[PDB]
Amino acid sequence: KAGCPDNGMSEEARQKFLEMHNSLRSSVALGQAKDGAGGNAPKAAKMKTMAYDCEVEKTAMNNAKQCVFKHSQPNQRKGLGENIFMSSDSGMDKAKAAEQASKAWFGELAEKGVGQNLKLTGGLFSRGVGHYTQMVWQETVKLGCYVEACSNMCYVVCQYGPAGNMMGKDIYEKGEPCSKCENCDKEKGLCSA
Ligand code: NI
């Protein structure tokens, strides 16, 4: 989603990543996301809209180009969170990978469940829903990803700014959509950018 170097990442992929993150964040904000732990995820009071960020994409690229399925050292993406994903199909279209990745990360909520208490405890950390929680992390507003065609996998990395998943903190403030943001995108339930 725009103005980024021609570094091998497709603008269609950027577009899918941003669109999937926001639309998925919206659906959670609106109380329309199925929750594995029963019922749905609580509405969000001020779920922010994400923008694409090329600088963030760049550090995501640094992880992806290494073609090793591993979270980068927090050191190699200061201030930034990270989600990773692989498909066995190395040459699969990048935007298609973007889509599969986002679905698979978000899918943690319906598959593993989270609950009504959005505080990131040691407990909730254990359920292993950390890719979902980073996707809908309230204060995370910058998205940057890279999809690399490795020898033995199609390797997808997204990094997130500011980093989400701070232990002891809430994923998002609960409440009616738009209810705590200056300007709301009323149809989507996210604070406007
Ligand atoms: Ni992880």
PDB file of C-alpha atoms in Angstrom, residues 104-191:
ATOM      1  CA  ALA A 104      -3.736 -18.558   9.160  1.00  0.00           C
ATOM      2  CA  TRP A 105      -2.603 -15.936  11.707  1.00  0.00           C
ATOM      3  CA  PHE A 106      -6.100 -14.650  12.300  1.00  0.00           C
ATOM      4  CA  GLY A 107      -7.344 -18.239  12.445  1.00  0.00           C
ATOM      5  CA  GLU A 108      -5.702 -18.632  15.838  1.00  0.00           C
ATOM      6  CA  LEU A 109      -8.697 -16.944  17.484  1.00  0.00           C
ATOM      7  CA  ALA A 110     -11.312 -19.383  16.172  1.00  0.00           C
ATOM      8  CA  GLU A 111      -9.004 -22.416  16.448  1.00  0.00           C
ATOM      9  CA  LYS A 112      -7.367 -21.873  19.805  1.00  0.00           C
ATOM     10  CA  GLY A 113      -9.663 -19.248  21.309  1.00  0.00           C
ATOM     11  CA  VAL A 114      -8.782 -16.236  23.439  1.00  0.00           C
ATOM     12  CA  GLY A 115     -11.528 -15.168  25.781  1.00  0.00           C
ATOM     13  CA  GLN A 116     -13.159 -12.003  27.052  1.00  0.00           C
ATOM     14  CA  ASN A 117     -10.138 -10.992  29.128  1.00  0.00           C
ATOM     15  CA  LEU A 118      -7.697  -9.471  26.627  1.00  0.00           C
ATOM     16  CA  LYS A 119      -4.777  -9.063  29.004  1.00  0.00           C
ATOM     17  CA  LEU A 120      -1.675 -10.815  27.683  1.00  0.00           C
ATOM     18  CA  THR A 121      -0.819 -13.025  30.646  1.00  0.00           C
ATOM     19  CA  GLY A 122       1.605 -15.917  30.820  1.00  0.00           C
ATOM     20  CA  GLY A 123      -1.609 -17.921  30.630  1.00  0.00           C
ATOM     21  CA  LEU A 124      -2.895 -16.355  27.429  1.00  0.00           C
ATOM     22  CA  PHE A 125       0.608 -16.383  25.997  1.00  0.00           C
ATOM     23  CA  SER A 126       0.600 -20.175  26.342  1.00  0.00           C
ATOM     24  CA  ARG A 127      -2.479 -20.758  24.202  1.00  0.00           C
ATOM     25  CA  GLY A 128      -0.178 -19.741  21.363  1.00  0.00           C
ATOM     26  CA  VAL A 129      -2.473 -17.135  19.798  1.00  0.00           C
ATOM     27  CA  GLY A 130       0.317 -14.591  19.424  1.00  0.00           C
ATOM     28  CA  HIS A 131      -0.080 -14.144  15.707  1.00  0.00           C
ATOM     29  CA  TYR A 132      -3.730 -13.290  16.054  1.00  0.00           C
ATOM     30  CA  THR A 133      -3.089 -10.953  18.998  1.00  0.00           C
ATOM     31  CA  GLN A 134      -0.481  -9.056  16.989  1.00  0.00           C
ATOM     32  CA  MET A 135      -2.861  -8.759  14.043  1.00  0.00           C
ATOM     33  CA  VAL A 136      -5.495  -6.989  16.147  1.00  0.00           C
ATOM     34  CA  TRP A 137      -3.154  -5.305  18.590  1.00  0.00           C
ATOM     35  CA  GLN A 138      -4.922  -1.979  19.162  1.00  0.00           C
ATOM     36  CA  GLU A 139      -1.937   0.390  19.112  1.00  0.00           C
ATOM     37  CA  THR A 140      -0.141  -1.287  16.212  1.00  0.00           C
ATOM     38  CA  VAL A 141      -0.703   0.940  13.192  1.00  0.00           C
ATOM     39  CA  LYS A 142       2.177   0.189  10.809  1.00  0.00           C
ATOM     40  CA  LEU A 143       2.253  -2.923   8.678  1.00  0.00           C
ATOM     41  CA  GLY A 144       5.200  -4.061   6.551  1.00  0.00           C
ATOM     42  CA  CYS A 145       5.665  -7.500   5.010  1.00  0.00           C
ATOM     43  CA  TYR A 146       7.782  -9.450   2.566  1.00  0.00           C
ATOM     44  CA  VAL A 147       7.177 -12.727   0.738  1.00  0.00           C
ATOM     45  CA  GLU A 148      10.237 -14.628  -0.469  1.00  0.00           C
ATOM     46  CA  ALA A 149      10.401 -17.630  -2.773  1.00  0.00           C
ATOM     47  CA  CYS A 150      12.845 -19.881  -0.944  1.00  0.00           C
ATOM     48  CA  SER A 151      14.300 -23.224  -1.968  1.00  0.00           C
ATOM     49  CA  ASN A 152      12.028 -25.240   0.237  1.00  0.00           C
ATOM     50  CA  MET A 153       9.133 -22.923   1.068  1.00  0.00           C
ATOM     51  CA  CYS A 154       7.294 -19.763   0.262  1.00  0.00           C
ATOM     52  CA  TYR A 155       8.330 -17.671   3.256  1.00  0.00           C
ATOM     53  CA  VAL A 156       6.162 -14.825   4.519  1.00  0.00           C
ATOM     54  CA  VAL A 157       7.177 -12.344   7.197  1.00  0.00           C
ATOM     55  CA  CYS A 158       5.156  -9.389   8.534  1.00  0.00           C
ATOM     56  CA  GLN A 159       6.561  -6.924  11.051  1.00  0.00           C
ATOM     57  CA  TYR A 160       4.476  -4.530  13.098  1.00  0.00           C
ATOM     58  CA  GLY A 161       4.904  -1.053  14.447  1.00  0.00           C
ATOM     59  CA  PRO A 162       4.682  -0.247  17.213  1.00  0.00           C
ATOM     60  CA  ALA A 163       5.254  -3.838  18.309  1.00  0.00           C
ATOM     61  CA  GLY A 164       2.272  -5.493  19.886  1.00  0.00           C
ATOM     62  CA  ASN A 165       2.227  -8.387  22.370  1.00  0.00           C
ATOM     63  CA  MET A 166       3.662  -6.617  25.385  1.00  0.00           C
ATOM     64  CA  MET A 167       3.313  -9.013  28.304  1.00  0.00           C
ATOM     65  CA  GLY A 168       0.900  -7.724  30.917  1.00  0.00           C
ATOM     66  CA  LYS A 169      -0.939  -5.397  28.493  1.00  0.00           C
ATOM     67  CA  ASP A 170      -4.332  -5.561  26.819  1.00  0.00           C
ATOM     68  CA  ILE A 171      -4.604  -6.502  23.162  1.00  0.00           C
ATOM     69  CA  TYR A 172      -7.293  -3.840  22.864  1.00  0.00           C
ATOM     70  CA  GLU A 173      -9.617  -1.681  24.990  1.00  0.00           C
ATOM     71  CA  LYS A 174     -13.041  -3.298  25.117  1.00  0.00           C
ATOM     72  CA  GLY A 175     -16.249  -1.424  24.361  1.00  0.00           C
ATOM     73  CA  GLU A 176     -18.574  -0.259  21.614  1.00  0.00           C
ATOM     74  CA  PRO A 177     -16.827   0.316  18.253  1.00  0.00           C
ATOM     75  CA  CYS A 178     -15.569   3.855  17.557  1.00  0.00           C
ATOM     76  CA  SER A 179     -16.592   4.716  21.151  1.00  0.00           C
ATOM     77  CA  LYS A 180     -13.145   5.989  22.210  1.00  0.00           C
ATOM     78  CA  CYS A 181     -11.645   7.364  19.048  1.00  0.00           C
ATOM     79  CA  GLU A 182     -11.599  10.941  17.810  1.00  0.00           C
ATOM     80  CA  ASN A 183     -12.639  10.136  14.257  1.00  0.00           C
ATOM     81  CA  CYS A 184     -14.240   6.792  13.556  1.00  0.00           C
ATOM     82  CA  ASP A 185     -14.717   4.966  10.303  1.00  0.00           C
ATOM     83  CA  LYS A 186     -18.313   4.276  11.311  1.00  0.00           C
ATOM     84  CA  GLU A 187     -18.954   1.461   8.827  1.00  0.00           C
ATOM     85  CA  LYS A 188     -15.873  -0.468   9.888  1.00  0.00           C
ATOM     86  CA  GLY A 189     -15.571   0.311  13.572  1.00  0.00           C
ATOM     87  CA  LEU A 190     -11.947   1.425  13.395  1.00  0.00           C
ATOM     88  CA  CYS A 191     -10.418   4.747  14.380  1.00  0.00           C
TER      89      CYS A 191
END
